[PDB]
Each structure stands twice: as structure tokens, then as C-alpha cells.
Amino acid sequence: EVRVPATALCVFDAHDGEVNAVQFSPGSRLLATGGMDRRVKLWEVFGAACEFKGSLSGSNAGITSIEFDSAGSYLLAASNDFASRIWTVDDYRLRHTLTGHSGKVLSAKFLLDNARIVSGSHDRTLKLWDLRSKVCIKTVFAGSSCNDIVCTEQCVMSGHFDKKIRFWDIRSESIVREMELLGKITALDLNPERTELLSCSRDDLLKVIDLRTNAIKQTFSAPGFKCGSDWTRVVFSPDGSYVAAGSAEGSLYIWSVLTGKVEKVLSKQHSSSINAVAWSPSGSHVVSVDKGCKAVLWAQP
């Protein structure tokens, strides 16, 4: 399976200021970080080391989300400058700027058809983009400022300021369900099987939603776990067995999805609030990035 990390193996200053986004490449060889300093930075991940490779430039405001495509060839980043951008990873080249939103873009994701992008914005819309034709396909009023989006082959799920998760049927391009939670939605993540939806909300609760029944399977909480950001990001481990979230006090919480219990509280490496976490697809590392420039790679020594 995957093993819960135990100790910090690498600590480094990744951005000039706040780090908002972090993701591993599908092959676990690259780490991408995204900051308020407007750069996506790529880092080569070694078993126990991490070194700077280069930057993906073009954004005029902070980076809010990062996603690799399934091939690991392309990287998609939303920005506070109202655009999303796509670069080819291997040559650092900007390939697309997606302009259209009239407010900060808080999330952008590849649909599972290798063709299209969905983005969600503080302008209270989702936009669907065709990358081949270089156009916005469709703009939909989403009821409330959108803080995160995730995609299955059937459904787009978006999380919002108004505490709702909205479920959009891809085939009928329409809303088919909404679930209301008890705090602003800060993040969403799907498990590897895309059968369960993980949410984080500003009531300081993580929830796992069974996508078959649209019911709450499990919650995760802890006395010291508090969101530090309206965009505190949380993730499943690559086997779906654990969930990870960074806290406002700088600790990385890991819970067991089966038992519901806290497995680890990884502390004493962040002096500021953790904004995002990522779990490498190989299980080699868990990374946390904070408001004070820092990335921490946690692993089993």
C-alpha cells in the first residue's frame, strides 16, 4: 500500500511569498509549486532531495491551482489575474492563455476527455474551454463564487462561497444536484477511483461524500486542525486510504479513511499557515506549502 510519512526530509524556500498551490507530476518525478509571486516553479523530486528546474511564466497575479494533464506533458494553472494558462512542462513554454473570466480564477481542471478545460472563478461562473479551437465553449452561472472544481468522466463538481457543492452533468451541461455544507468550501479532491469526493470547508471539517449515494461517508476533524485560508487544499493519498490537510498553525494532519482517526500530526516545520498539500502518486512524499515561502517534503526516512 502507501505508508504515512513520518519526518521532514527536505525543507526549502519555494516562492518569494505565499505558496498557494502544489502538485506532483503523474510519474512523481516533478513537483510543481505556485505562488503569489506569479510563478509556477518546477522542481525535480529525488528519493530524498529536491532541486529547482525552472519557472513557468506569464501570469500577472498569484497562482491559485496547478494540475498536470494525465500524460504529465502539460501543466494547467489558474491565476488571480482572471486567466488560466497552460505550459508544456519539458520546455517551459507557454502554450495557452485562457482569458474570459471577470474575476480571480480559483481553480482549473482538465476534463477526462483529453480536449477540454473547466475553470471556476470569483465571478460566480464556470467556463468550459476547447483547447484545440482556442475558445471558451460555454459560460454557466454557478450561483456563488467558486473556490475549487473537480472532474469525473460524468460530472463536474464545484465548491463555493455559499457552502454548496454543485454537481454538473457533463452530457447535459446542466446542474443536477447541490449539497450544502456548513462552511465555505475551500477545496475538493477525488479519490483515485473517482468514487468519493473529499471536501474541506471553513467549519474546519473534512468530509468524504459517496458519489453513488451523494451521502456523507466520513468526516475528519481534530482539535488543532483549522483552515488558514479560504483555499486551504486537501488531498487523498494515491491509494485512497488517507487524507491530508494543512492547518493554520502550520501542522500537517493525516487521517485514516477507514478508521477516521488521526494517523499523524506533522509539526514543527512550518511557521505559518499551510495553504496546500500534495501526495505523490508513488507514495514517496507528501508536500505541504505555506504562506511564508516554504515547502516541506515529508517522507519515511
mmCIF file of all heavy atoms in Angstrom, residues 1-32, unseen atoms left out:
data_model
loop_
_atom_site.group_PDB
_atom_site.id
_atom_site.type_symbol
_atom_site.label_atom_id
_atom_site.label_comp_id
_atom_site.label_asym_id
_atom_site.label_seq_id
_atom_site.Cartn_x
_atom_site.Cartn_y
_atom_site.Cartn_z
ATOM 1 N N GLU A 1 0.830 -1.201 0.000
ATOM 2 C CA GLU A 1 0.000 0.000 0.000
ATOM 3 C C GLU A 1 0.867 1.256 0.000
ATOM 4 O O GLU A 1 1.976 1.267 -0.527
ATOM 5 C CB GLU A 1 -0.935 0.004 1.215
ATOM 6 N N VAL A 2 0.335 2.320 0.580
ATOM 7 C CA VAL A 2 1.072 3.551 0.813
ATOM 8 C C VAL A 2 1.301 3.683 2.306
ATOM 9 O O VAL A 2 0.479 3.240 3.114
ATOM 10 C CB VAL A 2 0.283 4.749 0.244
ATOM 11 C CG1 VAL A 2 0.414 5.988 1.126
ATOM 12 C CG2 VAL A 2 0.732 5.013 -1.169
ATOM 13 N N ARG A 3 2.406 4.323 2.686
ATOM 14 C CA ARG A 3 2.750 4.493 4.091
ATOM 15 C C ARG A 3 2.686 5.966 4.465
ATOM 16 O O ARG A 3 3.084 6.834 3.689
ATOM 17 C CB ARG A 3 4.146 3.936 4.407
ATOM 18 C CG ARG A 3 4.334 2.462 4.043
ATOM 19 C CD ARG A 3 3.365 1.567 4.793
ATOM 20 N NE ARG A 3 3.627 0.137 4.605
ATOM 21 C CZ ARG A 3 3.029 -0.638 3.694
ATOM 22 N NH1 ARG A 3 2.119 -0.139 2.856
ATOM 23 N NH2 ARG A 3 3.344 -1.926 3.616
ATOM 24 N N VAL A 4 2.195 6.240 5.661
ATOM 25 C CA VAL A 4 2.061 7.629 6.103
ATOM 26 C C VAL A 4 3.454 8.200 6.356
ATOM 27 O O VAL A 4 4.284 7.537 6.997
ATOM 28 C CB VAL A 4 1.190 7.704 7.355
ATOM 29 C CG1 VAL A 4 1.158 9.107 7.926
ATOM 30 C CG2 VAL A 4 -0.223 7.262 7.014
ATOM 31 N N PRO A 5 3.749 9.399 5.889
ATOM 32 C CA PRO A 5 5.079 9.958 6.115
ATOM 33 C C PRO A 5 5.296 10.254 7.585
ATOM 34 O O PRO A 5 4.357 10.405 8.364
ATOM 35 C CB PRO A 5 5.054 11.242 5.280
ATOM 36 C CG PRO A 5 3.679 11.658 5.333
ATOM 37 C CD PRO A 5 2.872 10.380 5.226
ATOM 38 N N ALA A 6 6.556 10.334 7.960
ATOM 39 C CA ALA A 6 6.935 10.409 9.356
ATOM 40 C C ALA A 6 7.750 11.641 9.706
ATOM 41 O O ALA A 6 7.644 12.130 10.829
ATOM 42 C CB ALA A 6 7.741 9.160 9.745
ATOM 43 N N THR A 7 8.578 12.134 8.791
ATOM 44 C CA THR A 7 9.541 13.167 9.130
ATOM 45 C C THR A 7 9.793 14.028 7.907
ATOM 46 O O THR A 7 9.562 13.608 6.765
ATOM 47 C CB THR A 7 10.862 12.563 9.627
ATOM 48 O OG1 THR A 7 11.637 12.129 8.513
ATOM 49 C CG2 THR A 7 10.620 11.363 10.499
ATOM 50 N N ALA A 8 10.290 15.238 8.146
ATOM 51 C CA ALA A 8 10.626 16.127 7.043
ATOM 52 C C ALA A 8 11.983 15.732 6.490
ATOM 53 O O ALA A 8 12.964 15.634 7.238
ATOM 54 C CB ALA A 8 10.629 17.587 7.490
ATOM 55 N N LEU A 9 12.029 15.441 5.190
ATOM 56 C CA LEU A 9 13.278 15.128 4.510
ATOM 57 C C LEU A 9 13.880 16.303 3.774
ATOM 58 O O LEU A 9 15.096 16.313 3.552
ATOM 59 C CB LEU A 9 13.089 14.005 3.484
ATOM 60 C CG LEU A 9 12.751 12.603 3.981
ATOM 61 C CD1 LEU A 9 13.023 11.624 2.857
ATOM 62 C CD2 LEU A 9 13.517 12.216 5.226
ATOM 63 N N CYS A 10 13.066 17.271 3.371
ATOM 64 C CA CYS A 10 13.550 18.416 2.628
ATOM 65 C C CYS A 10 12.674 19.611 2.969
ATOM 66 O O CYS A 10 11.445 19.498 2.988
ATOM 67 C CB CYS A 10 13.522 18.116 1.138
ATOM 68 S SG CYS A 10 14.302 19.350 0.192
ATOM 69 N N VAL A 11 13.315 20.737 3.247
ATOM 70 C CA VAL A 11 12.639 21.987 3.550
ATOM 71 C C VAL A 11 13.305 23.065 2.714
ATOM 72 O O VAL A 11 14.537 23.155 2.695
ATOM 73 C CB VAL A 11 12.720 22.331 5.045
ATOM 74 C CG1 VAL A 11 12.028 23.640 5.307
ATOM 75 C CG2 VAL A 11 12.115 21.219 5.875
ATOM 76 N N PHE A 12 12.516 23.857 1.997
ATOM 77 C CA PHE A 12 13.130 24.889 1.180
ATOM 78 C C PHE A 12 12.161 26.022 0.907
ATOM 79 O O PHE A 12 10.945 25.862 0.962
ATOM 80 C CB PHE A 12 13.661 24.338 -0.143
ATOM 81 C CG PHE A 12 12.615 23.726 -1.022
ATOM 82 C CD1 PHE A 12 12.056 24.440 -2.076
ATOM 83 C CD2 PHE A 12 12.209 22.417 -0.823
ATOM 84 C CE1 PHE A 12 11.096 23.850 -2.887
ATOM 85 C CE2 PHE A 12 11.247 21.839 -1.627
ATOM 86 C CZ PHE A 12 10.700 22.562 -2.667
ATOM 87 N N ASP A 13 12.748 27.174 0.622
ATOM 88 C CA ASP A 13 12.026 28.372 0.213
ATOM 89 C C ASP A 13 11.660 28.235 -1.261
ATOM 90 O O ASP A 13 12.536 28.222 -2.132
ATOM 91 C CB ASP A 13 12.899 29.590 0.489
ATOM 92 C CG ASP A 13 12.939 29.944 1.968
ATOM 93 O OD1 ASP A 13 12.078 29.426 2.712
ATOM 94 O OD2 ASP A 13 13.828 30.713 2.383
ATOM 95 N N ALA A 14 10.372 28.075 -1.543
ATOM 96 C CA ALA A 14 9.935 27.823 -2.911
ATOM 97 C C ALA A 14 9.536 29.085 -3.651
ATOM 98 O O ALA A 14 9.742 29.174 -4.872
ATOM 99 C CB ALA A 14 8.754 26.843 -2.921
ATOM 100 N N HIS A 15 8.942 30.055 -2.963
ATOM 101 C CA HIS A 15 8.465 31.262 -3.623
ATOM 102 C C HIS A 15 8.856 32.465 -2.805
ATOM 103 O O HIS A 15 9.275 32.343 -1.660
ATOM 104 C CB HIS A 15 6.950 31.207 -3.847
ATOM 105 C CG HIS A 15 6.567 30.214 -4.894
ATOM 106 N ND1 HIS A 15 6.454 30.559 -6.222
ATOM 107 C CD2 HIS A 15 6.418 28.872 -4.840
ATOM 108 C CE1 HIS A 15 6.152 29.485 -6.926
ATOM 109 N NE2 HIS A 15 6.167 28.442 -6.118
ATOM 110 N N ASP A 16 8.732 33.637 -3.432
ATOM 111 C CA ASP A 16 9.073 34.880 -2.757
ATOM 112 C C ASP A 16 8.131 35.137 -1.597
ATOM 113 O O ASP A 16 8.548 35.654 -0.555
ATOM 114 C CB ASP A 16 9.025 36.045 -3.741
ATOM 115 C CG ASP A 16 9.956 35.852 -4.926
ATOM 116 O OD1 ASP A 16 10.898 35.036 -4.824
ATOM 117 O OD2 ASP A 16 9.745 36.525 -5.961
ATOM 118 N N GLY A 17 6.856 34.826 -1.769
ATOM 119 C CA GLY A 17 5.908 34.965 -0.684
ATOM 120 C C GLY A 17 5.042 33.738 -0.527
ATOM 121 O O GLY A 17 5.533 32.616 -0.531
ATOM 122 N N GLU A 18 3.743 33.971 -0.400
ATOM 123 C CA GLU A 18 2.776 32.912 -0.155
ATOM 124 C C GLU A 18 2.789 31.865 -1.270
ATOM 125 O O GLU A 18 2.808 32.194 -2.457
ATOM 126 C CB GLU A 18 1.407 33.577 -0.030
ATOM 127 C CG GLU A 18 0.233 32.700 0.098
ATOM 128 C CD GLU A 18 -0.953 33.437 0.729
ATOM 129 O OE1 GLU A 18 -0.992 34.701 0.738
ATOM 130 O OE2 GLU A 18 -1.865 32.762 1.211
ATOM 131 N N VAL A 19 2.758 30.588 -0.878
ATOM 132 C CA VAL A 19 2.622 29.481 -1.813
ATOM 133 C C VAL A 19 1.195 28.985 -1.718
ATOM 134 O O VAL A 19 0.735 28.618 -0.629
ATOM 135 C CB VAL A 19 3.597 28.337 -1.510
ATOM 136 C CG1 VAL A 19 3.601 27.353 -2.678
ATOM 137 C CG2 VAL A 19 4.977 28.867 -1.204
ATOM 138 N N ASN A 20 0.489 28.985 -2.840
ATOM 139 C CA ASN A 20 -0.936 28.688 -2.864
ATOM 140 C C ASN A 20 -1.253 27.306 -3.387
ATOM 141 O O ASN A 20 -2.346 26.795 -3.107
ATOM 142 C CB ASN A 20 -1.691 29.683 -3.760
ATOM 143 C CG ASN A 20 -1.524 31.100 -3.328
ATOM 144 O OD1 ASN A 20 -1.585 31.410 -2.142
ATOM 145 N ND2 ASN A 20 -1.341 31.990 -4.297
ATOM 146 N N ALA A 21 -0.356 26.718 -4.179
ATOM 147 C CA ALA A 21 -0.688 25.514 -4.916
ATOM 148 C C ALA A 21 0.532 24.619 -5.026
ATOM 149 O O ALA A 21 1.664 25.104 -5.094
ATOM 150 C CB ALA A 21 -1.175 25.862 -6.314
ATOM 151 N N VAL A 22 0.285 23.317 -5.028
ATOM 152 C CA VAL A 22 1.356 22.337 -5.134
ATOM 153 C C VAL A 22 0.778 21.055 -5.714
ATOM 154 O O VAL A 22 -0.366 20.685 -5.440
ATOM 155 C CB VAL A 22 2.033 22.118 -3.761
ATOM 156 C CG1 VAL A 22 1.042 21.585 -2.749
ATOM 157 C CG2 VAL A 22 3.224 21.179 -3.886
ATOM 158 N N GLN A 23 1.560 20.429 -6.580
ATOM 159 C CA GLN A 23 1.147 19.183 -7.204
ATOM 160 C C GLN A 23 2.373 18.398 -7.652
ATOM 161 O O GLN A 23 3.317 18.979 -8.192
ATOM 162 C CB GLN A 23 0.263 19.493 -8.412
ATOM 163 C CG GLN A 23 -0.510 18.333 -8.964
ATOM 164 C CD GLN A 23 -1.910 18.203 -8.372
ATOM 165 O OE1 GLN A 23 -2.760 17.545 -8.963
ATOM 166 N NE2 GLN A 23 -2.149 18.815 -7.210
ATOM 167 N N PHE A 24 2.326 17.079 -7.507
ATOM 168 C CA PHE A 24 3.306 16.218 -8.155
ATOM 169 C C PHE A 24 2.859 15.818 -9.557
ATOM 170 O O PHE A 24 1.666 15.675 -9.847
ATOM 171 C CB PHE A 24 3.523 14.935 -7.348
ATOM 172 C CG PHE A 24 4.266 15.133 -6.066
ATOM 173 C CD1 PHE A 24 3.576 15.289 -4.877
ATOM 174 C CD2 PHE A 24 5.656 15.106 -6.039
ATOM 175 C CE1 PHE A 24 4.256 15.459 -3.703
ATOM 176 C CE2 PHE A 24 6.341 15.274 -4.845
ATOM 177 C CZ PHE A 24 5.634 15.442 -3.688
ATOM 178 N N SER A 25 3.845 15.614 -10.433
ATOM 179 C CA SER A 25 3.566 15.066 -11.743
ATOM 180 C C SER A 25 3.103 13.616 -11.630
ATOM 181 O O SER A 25 3.367 12.944 -10.624
ATOM 182 C CB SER A 25 4.808 15.153 -12.626
ATOM 183 O OG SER A 25 5.884 14.391 -12.099
ATOM 184 N N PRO A 26 2.418 13.103 -12.662
ATOM 185 C CA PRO A 26 1.863 11.744 -12.572
ATOM 186 C C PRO A 26 2.900 10.675 -12.324
ATOM 187 O O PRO A 26 2.571 9.628 -11.742
ATOM 188 C CB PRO A 26 1.182 11.548 -13.932
ATOM 189 C CG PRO A 26 0.926 12.911 -14.437
ATOM 190 C CD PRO A 26 2.015 13.780 -13.905
ATOM 191 N N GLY A 27 4.137 10.887 -12.756
ATOM 192 C CA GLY A 27 5.207 9.934 -12.548
ATOM 193 C C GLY A 27 6.040 10.204 -11.319
ATOM 194 O O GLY A 27 7.058 9.536 -11.120
ATOM 195 N N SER A 28 5.626 11.153 -10.476
ATOM 196 C CA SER A 28 6.267 11.534 -9.218
ATOM 197 C C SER A 28 7.654 12.128 -9.391
ATOM 198 O O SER A 28 8.316 12.422 -8.383
ATOM 199 C CB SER A 28 6.323 10.359 -8.236
ATOM 200 O OG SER A 28 5.002 9.882 -8.016
ATOM 201 N N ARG A 29 8.095 12.368 -10.628
ATOM 202 C CA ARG A 29 9.437 12.881 -10.869
ATOM 203 C C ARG A 29 9.528 14.392 -10.722
ATOM 204 O O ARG A 29 10.614 14.901 -10.423
ATOM 205 C CB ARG A 29 9.904 12.482 -12.269
ATOM 206 N N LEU A 30 8.425 15.108 -10.894
ATOM 207 C CA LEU A 30 8.417 16.555 -10.813
ATOM 208 C C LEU A 30 7.445 17.023 -9.744
ATOM 209 O O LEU A 30 6.382 16.441 -9.543
ATOM 210 C CB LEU A 30 8.009 17.200 -12.138
ATOM 211 C CG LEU A 30 9.025 17.138 -13.268
ATOM 212 C CD1 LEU A 30 8.392 17.773 -14.494
ATOM 213 C CD2 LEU A 30 10.298 17.848 -12.873
ATOM 214 N N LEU A 31 7.826 18.114 -9.098
ATOM 215 C CA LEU A 31 6.993 18.835 -8.151
ATOM 216 C C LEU A 31 6.744 20.205 -8.746
ATOM 217 O O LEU A 31 7.678 20.857 -9.224
ATOM 218 C CB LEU A 31 7.676 18.987 -6.805
ATOM 219 C CG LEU A 31 6.904 19.760 -5.726
ATOM 220 C CD1 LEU A 31 5.735 18.992 -5.181
ATOM 221 C CD2 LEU A 31 7.863 20.118 -4.627
ATOM 222 N N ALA A 32 5.503 20.640 -8.725
ATOM 223 C CA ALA A 32 5.173 21.983 -9.159
ATOM 224 C C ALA A 32 4.593 22.757 -7.984
ATOM 225 O O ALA A 32 3.742 22.241 -7.252
ATOM 226 C CB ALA A 32 4.165 21.961 -10.282
#
